[PDB]
Amino acid sequence: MKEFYLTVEQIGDSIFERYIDSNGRERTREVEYKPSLFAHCPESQATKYFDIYGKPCTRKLFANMRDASQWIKRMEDIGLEALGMDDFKLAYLSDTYNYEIKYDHTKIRVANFDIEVTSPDGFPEPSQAKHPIDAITHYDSIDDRFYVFDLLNSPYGNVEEWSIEIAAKLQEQGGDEVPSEIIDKIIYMPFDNEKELLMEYLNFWQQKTPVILTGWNVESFAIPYVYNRIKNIFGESTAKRLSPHRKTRVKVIENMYGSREIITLFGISVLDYIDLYKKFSFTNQPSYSLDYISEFELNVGKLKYDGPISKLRESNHQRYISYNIIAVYRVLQIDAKRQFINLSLDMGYYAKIQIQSVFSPIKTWDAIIFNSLKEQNKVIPQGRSHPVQPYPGAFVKEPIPNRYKYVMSFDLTSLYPSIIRQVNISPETIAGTFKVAPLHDYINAVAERPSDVYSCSPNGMMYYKDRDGVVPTEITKVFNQRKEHKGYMLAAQRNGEIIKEALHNPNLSVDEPLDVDYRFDFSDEIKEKIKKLSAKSLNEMLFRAQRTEVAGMTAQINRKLLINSLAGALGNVWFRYYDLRNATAITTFGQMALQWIERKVNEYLNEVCGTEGEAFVLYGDTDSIYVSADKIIDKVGESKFRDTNHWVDFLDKFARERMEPAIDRGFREMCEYMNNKQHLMFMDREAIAGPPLGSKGIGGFWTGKKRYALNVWDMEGTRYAEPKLKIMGLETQKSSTPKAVQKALKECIRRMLQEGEESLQEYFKEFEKEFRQLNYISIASVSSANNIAKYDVGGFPGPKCPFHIRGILTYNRAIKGNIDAPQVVEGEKVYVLPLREGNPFGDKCIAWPSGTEITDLIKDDVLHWMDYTVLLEKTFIKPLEGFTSAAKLDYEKKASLFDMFDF
DNA sequence: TCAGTAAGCAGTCCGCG
DNA sequence: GCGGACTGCTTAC
Ligand SMILES: Nc1ncnc2c1ncn2[C@H]1C[C@H](O)[C@@H](COP(=O)(O)OP(=O)(O)OP(=O)(O)O)O1
Ligand SMILES: [Ca+2]
Ligand SMILES: [Ca+2]
Ligand SMILES: [Ca+2]
Ligand SMILES: [Ca+2]
């Protein structure tokens, strides 16, 4: 086995490293690492070290890390650049692991845990930790066991032991339905007192010390509560045993409107799953309670209990413990699906960083670039202080609001990273500047050619063409990884549609799902066998195909995220390679490329149609264009097509054989015009959109920038079994829109696009009539809630108070005194409902924590005073009016001359 | 919410004879 | 009532 690190820390003049040795065993060492840094030197001094600009450097070896940091300070005092990696543990990792790391996850101890704390006087604050810890469940990935630490005796109640037999039973048997697959993996340990529980947990922790520590809200709650509770009972030295190096630090996390404290456990990598989910899932959720997310991700029923959580242990300890175990398992199920831990390990080891730094693309890229340059004996520049400055971004075309029947879209592959590679944009490849003409002059190819020597961007920057910069070199490696995983994702998607087709004709037989790799397109043999399978086997295969697609999606989208964040990092003042000349070089080239190709596509289609000045490109955003295909369809005539799939095939062929070669020609010319290093502007067909053949559907519509809906038959080569709505920007896509309203608006859109005006009017009329029956949660609006304190004036709204904040203040007056009542947390999300005039709450709206039922203290009065009319007009009718006006249809039947006859 | 720009809509405040 | 200046929040890239 090749060795690999687990964790690394700097403590004073020592590096503390946990690692897997050449034998597969976990080991720990303390190393008195001697760091090197660099200063510029005369050319007359012989050296093998050069900075990124080719200037010679001398290496300075320090006796210890504190000497190195002190030298940095003195160099600042003098006014001279101190070069090299100033994060010494990253230098250590680079020296110790000077090869591509291959890690073995089975050797990495991944721990996920959850704690329960009974509290009669509200939320148990981790900084205080004044209440006993009465349950801990800790899952260990190496043992594959759930360790349950259960407190039987508390000042808040003495209880009986948890029963595994009752836990295993159906909820309908009075059981807790702990999944059968984990029952045999539970190791249950009851305790007669809290001191005993905590002492044993720490000894356990010592034996099975987590490398990766995760769970749900562990960084903000579980870890600081456990640390502070042990501190309060035993003293700080005992609490520090949670760190394998016995070092901890209270870290203050600053935000815009306040701050919070977490505990840094040296020698542990905390990856809170809530944070992994928020950053890598590409969702925005109305609520981030584990119950809400588990329902969303896994389609598992809410964990139900009677009464408040503060009385659960006393009333039903059996269920209390079971639900603590289930909560731990749910995080493992989410990870089995989403694979964010796998993602973190992959990226972490690739970059050679602490695993927890995967949350920071700046730290990630700093390490990738440093390791890359080190291999060439090159020396990285010092980080400098820069003032924050705004800079321009992408171009977005103003569309003419309208219905659009037939649409084909085209999109540039990994645009910003492709621009970096094409132009050769890097700190060390800057060659100079040229005199800029207005952007429209480059778009229309009338400006003089920027350079005959260097590779250019329309912002005025020129770059060397003789060799690739380190940024293009390293961004390419990650792009190639992304491409591989996207390939797997798309194959699983295509395979999924094959199964969906086969499910139209399932066989009446008893059989098994096929043993296949869903990352690769199904062969003819697999397809034949699929056509003979039962619905039960097909559905299992569909589930597996969809799980493979999700795994591919995680892997690809987050590598895309990483490479796009490098382009972004060039515009962040804390990045070592911050440079607005390079950041703007990317964004400005992107603006040009889009408007250039818009002109080229318009010119090409006007030619094939024999017209002049006709606008075929109806819309574009950053790197995509949407092309009206109405004229193309009309050139053969709708009557000539056998079915929907026939015109879809026809447009697919037109895009691939006619438009893409024309687009490629346009970009090759643009590359030559800018004298770029390498043509990498690859714009491929994305969506084919239109109404069902022979229907009154409108196909698609735009209301304005970033606001449109399309009925899509084929997306990136995936031919759907059923048409899919592609809706961007509209209220159906916003987490702030009520759940039931999202659903109804989506059905309104489906009907508009697929069925037409009459169908739309039929559905609107019904929804307007029945909506008052919808559950209050399903019709509540959602909002994040920041700066609640600023707008609180004696419990009443101050000047310019936001509507959702007003609702919170209303709530806070209505629950006044009740220390048990759920408190709205600053920066979290709330449900919001409008209230009718003259209500007992004394205001026009009320808000409460999202993902929860409103407290029974005030639930009946809210339901009685809920303003359904205002709710309907604001969340449903107003957006729908927006859609229908843009698409030139009516949601209510207009009166005609036929209303004058028989009955 | 510790960890790039563009741009939409809700709502406040208040003008607009 | 609509719209402009503004805050707040949320998407699309
Ligand atoms: N989350 C983001 N952070 C920073 N920049 C972004 C982000 N999303 C998009 N961009 C910028 C960089 C992208 O290259 C550009 C176009 O976005 P988009 O078309 O969604 O992805 P892409 O072109 O990078 O990859 P794809 O190959 O999937 O189309 O907009
Ligand atoms: Ca398990
Ligand atoms: Ca793209
Ligand atoms: Ca069949
Ligand atoms: Ca795009």
Any atom of strand B under 7 A from CB of A260?
yes
Residue A432 in 3-state DSSP?
strand
In chain A, the N- to C-terminal Cα span, in Å, equals 87
Strands A624-628 and A49-51: unpaired
Positive or negative: CA dihedral A785, A791, A794, A795: negative
- Give the integer Cα–Cα distance in Å for A422 and A418: 6
- Rounded Cα distance between A600 and A607, Å, is 11
CA distance A23 to A26: 9
Quote the CA–CA distance of A148 and A540 in Å, as a whole number.
33
The answer to whether A487 CB sits below 7 Å from nucleic acid chain C is: no
The count of residues in chain A is 903
Q: State chain A's maximal CA–CA distance in angstroms.
A: 106
Question: Which is nearest to A360 in space by CA: A565, A207, A86?
Answer: A565
Indicate the burial class of A583 (C-beta count within 10 angstroms; 0-12, 13-18, 19 or more): buried
Closest CA to A533 of A544, A548, A549: A544
Residue type, A19: Y
Cα-based distances in Å from A187 to A60, A148, A152, A163, A325: 54, 6, 16, 12, 11
- Give dist(CA A271, CA A223) in Å, integer: 12
Query: Residue type at A684?
Result: D
The ligand 1 site (C-beta within 6 Å) comprises A 411-416, 560-561, 564-565, 568, 622-623
Crossing angle (nearest 10°) for helices A470-502 and A535-569: 160
What residues contact A415, with CB distance under 8 A and at least 6 apart?
A: A590, A593, A622, A623
> Helices marked H in A116-272 — which ranges?
164-168, 180-183, 194-207, 223-234, 236-239
Q: Is the CB of A198 under 7 A from strand C?
A: no
Own/partner contacts of A246-254, CB < 8 Å, gap of 24 or more, are: A247/A9, A247/A11
Pairwise CA distance, residues A713 & A38, whole Å: 59
Radius of gyration of chain A (CA): 31
Which residues, in sequence order, are CB contacts of A575 under 8 Å at separation 6+?
Answer: A362, A365, A366, A569
Residue whose CA is at the smallest distance from ligand 1 atom 28: A414
The tokens describing A60, both together, are 């300075």
Our measurement of the distance from residue A315's CA atom to the centroid of its chain's CA atoms, rounded to an integer in Å, reads 39
Residues A843, A407: Cα–Cα separation, whole Å: 47
Technique used to solve these coordinates? X-ray
* Burial of A861 per CB tally in 10 Å (0-12, 13-18, 19+): middle
CB atoms within 10 A of CB A236: 12
Spell out the domains of chain A, with CATH numbers in brackets: 1-108+340-382 (3.30.342.10), 109-339 (3.30.420.10), 383-468+573-729 (3.90.1600.10), 469-572 (1.10.287.690), 730-774+867-888 (1.20.1280.300), 775-866 (3.40.1820.10)
Residue A686 CA to ligand 1 center (angstroms) comes to: 14
Q: What is the DSSP string of A672-695?
A: HHTT-SS----EEEEEEE-PPTTS
Q: Which pairs count as long-range contacts for A58-63, CB under 8 Å and 24+ apart, including other chains?
A: A60/A36, A61/A34, A61/A35, A61/A36, A62/A34, A62/A35, A62/A36, A62/A37, A63/A34
For residues A488 and A552, the answer to whether their CB atoms sit within 8 Å is yes
Cα gap A508→A340, rounded to integer Å = 39
Nearest to A364 by CA among A575, A72, A554, A96: A575
Q: Rounded to an integer, what distance in angstroms lies between the CA atom of residue A28 and that of residue A267?
A: 10
Structure tokens at A172: 């309908």
**Helix and strand counts by DSSP (H, E) for chain A:** 27, 33
Quote the strand ranges of A92-154, DSSP E: 110-117, 133-140, 145-151, 153-154
The answer to whether A11 and A4 have CB atoms below 8 angstroms apart is no
* Residue A646 CB lies within 7 Å of the nucleic strand C: no
Strand C contacted by A783 CB (< 7 A)? yes
Cα–Cα nearest to A672, from A455, A412, A411, A419: A455
The tokens of A287 are what? 């609520």
Please list the residues that pair with A626 across neighbouring strands: A409, A619
Q: Which residue's CA lies nearest to atom 24 of ligand 1?
A: A414
Q: φ, ψ for residue A821 (rounded to 5)?
A: -65, 140
Closest by Cα among A853, A843, A849, A858 to A806? A843
> CA-CA distances (angstroms) from residue A466 to A469, A565, A676?
10, 26, 11
Q: E strand or H helix at A728, and its extent?
A: strand A718-728
CA distance A594 to A335: 38
**A761 contacts A890 by C-beta, under 8 angstroms:** yes
Instruction: Enter the tokens of residue A688.
Output: 């084919």
d(CA A496, CA A625): 28
Ramachandran bin of A451, using left for φ above 0, alpha for ψ from -120 to 50, beta for the remaining angles: beta
Nearest to A698, CA basis, from A756, A743, A641: A756
User: From the centroid of its chain, how far is CA A494?
Assistant: 23
Torsion A674-A675-A677-A683 (CA) sign: positive
Q: Where are the alpha helices (DSSP H) in A831-877?
A: 859-865, 868-872
Identify the residue whose tokens are 């086997």: A537
Q: Which of A398, A808, A447, A784 is nearest to A621 (CA)?
A: A398
Task: Please name which of A241, A414, A420, A271 lies closest in space to residue A355, comparing C-alpha atoms.
Answer: A271
Token pair of A534 as six digits: 């039962």
Burial A144-170 (b: 16+ CB within 10 A, else e): ebbbbbbbbbbebeebeebbbeebbee
- Tell me how far apart the alpha carbons of residues A566 and A571 are, in angstroms, rounded to a whole number: 9
- What are the tokens at A721? 């079994």
A446 token code pair: 């009338």
Q: How far apart are CA A744 and CA A739, in angstroms?
A: 9
Å from A800 (CA) to B16 (C1')? Answer: 21
Q: CA of A625 vs C1' of B15, distance in Å?
A: 41
User: Which residue, among A651, A650, A649, A661, has the nearest Cα to A604 in the 3D structure?
Assistant: A661
User: Looking at the DSSP assignment, which residues form a beta bridge with residue A718?
Assistant: A715
* CA atoms of A894 and A109, how far apart (whole Å): 67
Which atom of ligand 1 lies at the shortest distance from residue A419's CA? 14
Inter-helix orientation angle A223-234/A194-207, to 10°: 120
Burial of A666 (0-12, 13-18, 19+ CB in 10 A): buried
Strand (E) or helix (H) holding A314: helix A312-338
Resolution in angstrom units: 2.0
Q: What count of other Cβ atoms lies within 10 Å of the Cβ of residue A731?
A: 22
Nucleotides of C under 7 A from a protein CB: 7-13
Q: Strand C within 7 Å of which CB atoms in A 683-712?
A: 706
The H-or-E segment that residue A430 falls in is strand A430-433
d(CA A242, CA A394): 48
How many Cα atoms sit within 13 Å of A763 on the Cβ side? 21
Question: Rounded to the nearest whole angstrom, what is the distance from the C-alpha of residue A746 to the centroid of ligand 5?
Answer: 22
Whole-number Å distance between alpha carbons of A56 and A75: 18
Q: At what angle do helices A580-609 and A660-673 cross, to 10 degrees?
A: 140
Query: Which residue in the block uniquely carries the two structure tokens 């296949």?
Result: A516
Distance CA A811, CA A843 (A): 10
**3-class SS at A343?**
helix
- Find the Å distance, CA of residue A482 to C1' of nucleotide C13: 18
Distance CA A690, CA A405 (A): 6
Provide φ and ψ at A191, rounded to 5°.
-135, 140
Output DSSP code: residue A380. Answer: P
Report yes or no: A736 and A782 within 8 Å, Cβ to Cβ: yes
Q: Which of residues 708-767 of A touch strand C (CB under 7 A)?
A: 727-729, 733-736
Name every residue whose Cβ is closer than 8 Å to that of residue A522 and which is 6 or more positions away in sequence: A495, A498, A516, A530
Per the DSSP assignment, residues forming a β-bridge with A719 are A714
Q: Is A396 helix (H, G, I), strand (E, B) or coil?
A: strand
Shortest CA distance to A31 belongs to which of A12, A44, A49?
A12
Q: Which residues lie closer than 8 Å to A398 by C-beta, 6 or more apart?
A: A704, A705
What residue type is assigned to position A819 of the chain?
Answer: I
